[PDB]
From a paper:
The P-loop (residues G10-S17) is responsible for phosphate binding, whereas the Switch I (D30-D38) and Switch II regions (G60-E76) are critical for interactions with guanosine nucleotide exchange factors and effector proteins. To increase understanding of the effects of non-covalent inhibition of nucleotide exchange on multiple isoforms and mutant forms of Ras, we have isolated a pan-reactive antibody mimetic, Designed Ankyrin Repeat Protein (DARPin) K27, which potently inhibits nucleotide exchange, and also a comparator, DARPin K55, which inhibits the Ras/Raf interaction.
However, in contrast to the Ras/Sos complex, the binding of K27 leaves both the switch 1 loop and the bound GDP in near-identical conformational states to the non-liganded, GDP-bound Ras, whereas Sos binding distorts switch 1, breaks the network of nucleotide contacts and favours nucleotide dissociation. An overlay of the K27/Ras G12V complex with the non-liganded structures of Ras G12V in the active conformation suggests that the active, GTP-bound state is not readily compatible with K27 binding. DARPin K27 binds preferentially to the inactive GDP form, with an epitope close to the switch regions in their inactive conformation. DARPin K27 however shows novel properties for a non-covalent protein inhibitor of Ras, since it binds preferentially to inactive Ras and acts by nucleotide exchange inhibition, thus providing a new tool for investigating this mechanism of action. The crystal structure of DARPin K27 in complex with Ras was used to design a non-binding variant of DARPin K27, lacking the ability to bind Ras, by alanine replacement of three interface residues to make K27 Null3.
Numbering used by the authors:
A (entry chain A): 1 to 165
B (entry chain B): 22 to 177
Write the structure that this text describes.
C-alpha cells in the first residue's frame, strides 16, 4: 500500500496538532502542548486505494530540527494552515509557501491551503482574500474546523489527490 | 484552589522554586491536562532536570502516559534530553514502553537522529528489534532515513 509523507505547516496556535489528532483519533483537543513535534500515522481508504498517511505536525519552529528538515526535503504534500481569526497566521502563509519552494527546489509542489477554526463566530480573515491567495498559488483552499471535524478529512484527502496528480 | 494547573505551568516553565512551594501546599504531582500530560511529562519534554528529579523524589508516576500513549521517557527521548532519559530509567521507567502506534522510545530517538540516546536506551535493555504496529523497527528507520551512523550502532 502507498505511503504519503504529509507535512502540516503554519504559525503557532492555528490548530495543526488539533487537526492531526481529530483526523487520526476522532477527538478535539483544547490544550495540546504547543512544542511537541511528532509524526502520527493513519491507515485510510482514499478513492478505493488503502493507503498509509505519515503526517508530520510541525511545532517548535523557534528551535532547530534534524527530523523536521528531513521531512521537509523528502515530504510529498504540504498542509498550509492558518486560523480564520488570526491575520498574522494568514500573512505567514507567504513565508511558508516560499520556504517550501526553496527546500523542494520547485515552483510546483503538492499543497493545500487550510483556513482552520471556521466553527468560530468572529473571523478576521476573509474567505475571498484566502480564495484569491490559493487561486494565485494554483492550489486548493479548504475551510476546516478541528472542533466539529468539518473539512478535516477533505483537507487531508485533497492533498493525497494532489500528490497522485 | 487548583494548584494542579499552577504546578503543570511551573513544571513547563522551569520554575523549580514555584514547584517546591506548590507541592509543599499539597498540589498533586500527578495532575494532568485534558490530554494526560503530567508535570513530569512537561518537565521531561522541556529539559528541566532539577524539576524532573524533585517530581520523582516526590512520588510522581514515571510511566504515566498521555492520551497518545507516550511516557515521560518517550518525550525525553523525543527531545534529546540525555541526562533526563538516564534519571527516568534510574527511577524505573519502562525502556520498551509502547505508545498508541506501538513506538518505543528507541523508535522515537532513532527517528529524530538522537544517537547518544539510542546507545543509552539499548544499554538499559531496549529491544533493538521491536516492531511498531505498522511493522517498522529501528533498523527500518535507519534505512528509511539513510542514516548511516544509526545503522552502524544497530550492529557493531
Ligand atoms: N474553536 C476551535 N478551536 C481550535 C481549532 N483548532 C484548534 N483549536 C484550539 O486552538 C488551540 C491551538 O490548537 P493547536 O492544535 O495547539 O495548534 P498548533 O499550536 O498549531 O499545534 C487549542 O486550544 C485548540 O483547542 C478549531 O478548529 N476550532
Ligand atoms: Mg502543535
Amino acid at each position: 500500500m502507498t505511503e504519503y509523507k504529509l507535512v502540516v505547516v503554519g504559525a503557532v496556535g492555528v490548530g495543526k496538532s488539533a487537526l492531526t489528532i481529530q483526523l487520526i483519533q476522532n477527538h478535539f483537543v483544547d490544550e495540546y502542548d504547543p512544542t511537541i513535534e511528532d509524526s502520527y500515522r493513519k491507515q485510510v481508504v482514499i478513492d478505493g486505494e488503502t493507503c498509509l498517511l505519515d503526517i508530520l505536525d510541525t511545532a517548535g519552529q523557534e528551535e532547530y530540527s534534524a527530523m523536521r528538515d528531513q521531512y521537509m526535503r523528502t515530504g510529498e504534500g504540504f498542509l498550509c494552515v492558518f486560523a480564520i481569526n488570526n491575520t498574522k497566521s494568514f500573512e505567514d502563509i507567504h513565508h511558508y509557501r516560499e520556504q517550501i519552494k526553496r527546500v523542494k527546489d520547485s515552483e510546483d509542489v503538492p499543497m493545500v491551503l487550510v483556513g482552520n477554526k471556521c466553527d468560530l463566530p468572529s473571523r478576521t480573515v476573509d474567505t475571498k482574500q484566502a480564495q484569491d491567495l490559493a487561486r494565485s498559488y494554483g492550489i486548493p483552499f479548504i475551510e476546516t474546523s478541528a472542533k466539529t471535524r468539518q473539512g478535516v478529512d477533505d483537507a487531508f484527502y485533497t492533498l493525497v489527490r494532489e500528490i497522485r496528480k | 484552589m487548583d494548584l494542579g494547573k499552577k504546578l503543570l505551568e511551573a513544571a513547563r516553565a522551569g520554575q523549580d522554586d514555584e514547584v517546591r512551594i506548590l507541592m509543599a501546599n499539597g498540589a498533586d504531582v500527578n495532575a494532568h491536562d485534558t490530554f494526560g500530560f503530567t508535570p513530569l511529562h512537561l518537565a521531561a519534554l522541556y529539559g528541566h532536570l532539577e524539576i524532573v528529579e524533585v517530581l520523582l523524589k516526590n512520588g510522581a508516576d514515571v510511566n504515566a502516559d498521555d492520551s497518545y500513549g507516550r511516557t515521560p521517557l518517550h518525550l525525553a527521548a523525543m527531545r534529546g534530553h540525555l541526562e533526563i532519559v538516564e534519571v527516568l530509567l534510574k527511577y524505573g521507567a519502562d525502556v520498551n514502553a509502547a505508545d498508541e502506534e506501538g513506538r518505543t522510545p528507541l523508535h522515537l530517538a532513532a527517528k529524530r537522529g538522537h544517537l547518544e540516546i539510542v546507545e543509552v536506551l539499548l544499554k538499559n535493555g531496549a529491544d533493538v528489534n521491536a516492531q511498531d504496529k505498522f511493522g517498522k523497527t529501528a533498523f527500518d528507520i535507519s534505512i528509511d532515513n539513510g542514516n548511516e551512523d544509526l545503522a552502524e550502532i544497530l550492529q557493531k
